[PDB]
Symmetry: C3
Subunit: 229 residues, 3 copies
């Protein structure tokens, strides 16, 4: 019952969720427009567009109650967060000699499952899946830190630096998510610490996404342009 | 309460829906068969097979109530309408030199998001997401209309003509759905106009699909066949 | 009412469901490591990792009631069993000249659709969709038995033998599922027959998946390995 907890009484988080949704939409447009002017491949503009627009659309379930609303987080991250890791995977490939799409799939597949464990954690009211999720996230991080790093180092010195920058960014932001999820004291969530109240929890999982999507998109695409100079 | 409305009173749409399903299943079997007879790549038979068989299976939720029924259309279009666009895209690729698979993804991705907006709108009884869906639709027809057209025009004249025909056929039909959705007077479906009664909506929503899937299946495969015969 | 029936009273399947999840997680870790030890392509490890881990996860919904619980088998096979087939397909492709990724798509799509029929059947309380599934599954067996077999025979004798063994293994086992599903006396799923009680059904759908996931991942990677050893 995440939704009722988030929107009962004040629903203080709604200004933030509204602002997220709008900055998402306008960012999505800008992302489509950018790579025309920017000298980065279109696939990046496109991917970030979907990251941000999919996220936006899902968060509308907090403004308007549907059957989705209690799980709108996992509906969003389901497809947003693998697209993020795809953006990050393809950047690494960009200049490089050997592309490795089996690793892309692993990268993306882990994220998806990771996010489904959250889904499962909450629905079950049980933390067991959450632990499996965290192990997977470590697996993602490993994947980013090593194999994809190496592939990125095959290419130009600028791009490899760009990857490292993006990867550590995305790495560390990702690790925050299971944190605020665990320490949330929303009754539904089986996190056994209770530090953040529903509105706080909700607001964290608006600001955090903002950095991981809206900023990420620009960060990714400016960094690839600025490398290829 | 889309299902509830649709099966209200007589349930007038009942037998149309049944004929759509039966018909889908038979189309499917042909689609698997045709390519071998037709000198068209098997991949095309396979895509149309799933399109027409997926749709048919989802529509059985109007004949037997389930937790899916209210959102059946979306459960269908979710995977059917990107497959439709995959065929169209792959047709454009068929005889061309440069293949843009990131554009294929954008094409297919937009459709999926664009059907999910439809689902969101009904689920929150809210019209907002629909507008984004409409914006995405226009991105789809733009994609089809230009980049994919460009790629199509590297190929022989017949294959370019084929794409151009199918691209208009599916583009025009595709714009009808958000129309009759908005137009519909089922209450679950938001938007102000209530022009179409639930049975009229339902019947619009098996007629258009019959043209987008069954007819489209054959049309695609015959245009690709006629173009390759014309150029050999 | 699937969860309630299974877990009601003694919940006699809970140990098997536990033993299954624990072995799945452990098998998964091993699958990731095995490829580097066997000179088998890492991708096979990846795919088998996800098969057991995803399956394991979905089965936690029998240990803890959720909205997914009643439909957990479908949520599992919905992605697990296309992956099982991806592995089969890629095995066949492994030594071969022609990679036909449309057959891979057809293989995977039939499976996924074929699981969704099971979910529709339960959700509808109707046996109709089950029947489409069975057809579809005979589509799958067909694919495996022929075109995929031909592509395997393109390769070395060791690789070709590997595929045919696995294809047999997995074919036979895949047929058992629509059988147990049908004869199961869980009220929710609409077989005419009521031979198994929920616990027996549950046990069967623990032990059979053990052989199709945990065992199969090892079997697949060792057969390839062996095969690659046999030809310098
Ligand atoms: C834009 C949103 C982003 C970048 C979300 C990232 C979310 C995660 C990495 C969540 C991870 C989780 C676990 C590792 C365990 C289960 C709970 C989750 C879903 C928060
Ligand atoms: C076989 C069925 C087909 C080809 C259906 C096409 C359906 C659409 C293009 C629906 C479009 C919609 C929007 C663009 C926004 C409103 C919601 C939808 C799904 C009606
Ligand atoms: C690891 C689990 C596996 C390999 C499960 C296989 C499951 C099936 C082949 C199920 C088949 C079905 C039909 C053919 C029709 C009715 C619905 C199903 C899912 C029982
Ligand atoms: C792509 C972003 C554009 C979205 C357009 C938003 C219009 C929604 C109208 C708000 C109704 C209150
Ligand atoms: C507008 C120009 C598009 C030309 C495409 C011709 C095919 C149109 C088929 C539509 C039948 C309803
Ligand atoms: C490979 C290892 C597989 C181990 C499976 C062991 C599970 C056996 C548990 C059976 C207990 C059934 C008791 C039910 C009645 C109390
Ligand atoms: C391979 C070793 C894994 C064996 C795990 C056995 C687990 C048995 C669980 C016993 C059930 C206790 C009551 C639910
Ligand atoms: C070339 C391989 C194509 C993969 C087919 C994908 C099968 C599963 C599709 C699931 C649809 C998501 C909704
Ligand atoms: C549901 C999880 C899927 C989220 C998006 C998946 C898109 C992947 C895709 O477009 O493939 C691109 C890349 O793997 C091809 O190299
Ligand atoms: C849905 C949860 C994960 C399911 C899929 C994740 C793993 C799929 C990756 C398959 C793979 O690596 O094979 C592709 C390889 O042949 C590309 O060359
Ligand atoms: C199921 C959602 C996760 C998507 C993963 C996927 O599409 O793997 C892509 C990989 O096979 C590209 O080579
Ligand atoms: C944690 C979820 C799955 C992790 C994927 C494990 C794959 C790691 C293997 C890397 C790879 O094969 O790249 C080659 C490099 O390790 C040595 O050449
Ligand atoms: C090759 C063309 C085959 C067309 C077959 C469509 C026939 C479907 C008609 C069903 C019908 O009218 O019965 C519906 C109603 O009686 C069910 O209760
Ligand atoms: C692609 C498959 C072509 C058509 C397959 C569906 C035919 C099976 C029909 C089953 C049926 O109608 O039985 C339903 C009855 O037992 C319950 O009302
Ligand atoms: C798929 C091939 C045609 C089978 C469709 C039959 C659906 C069905 O039997 O639903 C009728 C329901 O009213 C039975 O009570
Ligand atoms: C991403 C794919 C989203 C699909 C969500 C599930 C499809 C519809 C469904 O779950 O039926 C809604 C039912 O729960 C309404 O009560
Ligand atoms: C399941 C609902 C969407 C179906 C997606 C399955 C196909 C998606 C992408 C396939 C494609 O791009 O085929 C060509 C690919 O092998 C690139 O070489
Ligand atoms: C359909 C559900 C996700 C849509 C994305 C499909 C996709 O990524 O396939 C197109 C492209 O990746 C083929 O290479
Ligand atoms: C549900 C929202 C997701 C829509 C599809 C997400 C990805 C669409 C585009 C993928 C892409 O650009 O991959 C192309 C790349 O693999 C070319 O090498
Ligand atoms: C939904 C819409 C998402 C994509 C809309 C814009 C992306 C199209 C890019 C483009 O066409 O650049 C390729 C160039 O060759 C076109 O002529
Ligand atoms: C409501 C939206 C429907 C309008 C779409 C019709 C597009 C048909 C015209 C395409 C065109 O002008 O492309 C010509 C190209 O050579 C210009 O770069
Ligand atoms: C290794 C993964 C742990 C094995 C499964 C543990 C399990 O699912 O326990 C969770 C449930 O019993 C909580 O009541
Ligand atoms: C490779 C083995 C890794 C860990 C296996 C542990 C499974 C055995 C644990 C059985 C247990 O918890 O029995 C508790 C019982 O008394 C509760 O009824
Ligand atoms: C993704 C294509 C269709 C699969 C639908 C996935 C939904 C599975 C879960 C359904 C559910 O939670 O409804 C069951 C219960 O809440 C209603 O009795
Ligand atoms: C439905 C489950 C499919 C998840 C992703 C599988 C996939 O991406 O395999 C396609 C690719 O490995 C074929 O080259
Ligand atoms: C779980 C949803 C996964 C979406 C299925 C599409 C996967 C895809 O586009 O990967 C196949 C493509 O890379 C061909 O190898
Ligand atoms: C229920 C969802 C079923 C989706 C399965 C449709 C996948 C069949 C598409 C074949 C494909 O994209 O092959 C591409 C490759 O052959 C291009 O050369
Ligand atoms: C395909 C399987 C067809 C079964 C069937 O015809 O049963 C329909 C009904 O008469 C069963 O009593
Ligand atoms: C649902 C499964 C139906 C898939 C049928 C695909 C076509 C059947 C095999 C085929 O295409 O073999 C091609 C090969 O023999 C060309 O020589
Ligand atoms: C009931 C049968 C459904 C599955 C069809 C089995 C087809 C096997 C086959 O055609 O093997 C012939 C192969 O040896 C041709 O070289
Ligand atoms: C590969 C070994 C298969 C293991 C099957 C799992 C056992 C499930 C119990 C079945 C059962 O006892 O059916 C017999 C009885 O219900 C029929 O009268
Ligand atoms: C949790 C552990 C599950 C136990 C299953 C592992 C046994 C699978 C059998 C592997 C095998 O015999 O491969 C060797 C054979 O193919 C010749 O190399
Ligand atoms: C605990 C079970 C350990 C079994 C290990 C057997 C093994 O490593 O032999 C397989 C490999 O040496 C084949 O070359
Ligand atoms: C394993 C799940 C894969 C994708 C299915 C997503 C499930 C749909 C999201 C939540 C939902 O269906 O809500 C159903 C019920 O909890 C409403 O209260």
């Amino acid at each position: 019952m995440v939704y009722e907890a988030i929107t009962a009484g004040g629903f203080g988080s709604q200004p933030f969720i509204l602002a997220y949704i709008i900055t998402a939409m306008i960012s999505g447009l800008l992302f489509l427009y950018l790579p025309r002017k920017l000298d980065v491949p279109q696939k990046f503009g496109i991917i970030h567009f979907f990251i941000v627009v999919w996220s936006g659309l899902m968060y509308t379930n907090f403004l308007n109650q549907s059957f989705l609303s209690d799980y709108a987080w996992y509906m969003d991250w389901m497809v947003s967060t693998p697209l993020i890791l795809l953006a990050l995977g393809l950047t690494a490939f960009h200049g490089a000699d050997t592309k490795r799409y089996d690793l892309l799939g692993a990268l993306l597949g882990a994220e998806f499952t990771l996010v489904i464990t959250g889904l499962l954690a909450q629905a079950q009211g049980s933390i067991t899946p959450y632990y499996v999720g965290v192990l997977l996230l470590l697996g993602v991080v490993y994947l980013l830190a090593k194999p994809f790093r190496e592939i990125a180092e095959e290419s130009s010195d600028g791009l490899a630096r760009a990857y490292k920058i993006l990867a550590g960014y995305i790495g560390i932001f990702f690790l925050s998510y299971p944190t605020v999820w665990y320490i949330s004291g929303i009754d539904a969530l089986p996190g056994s610490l209770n530090i953040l109240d529903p509105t706080q929890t909700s607001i964290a999982l608006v600001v955090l996404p903002f950095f991981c999507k809206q900023v990420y998109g620009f960060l990714d695409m400016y960094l690839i342009h600025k490398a290829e100079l």
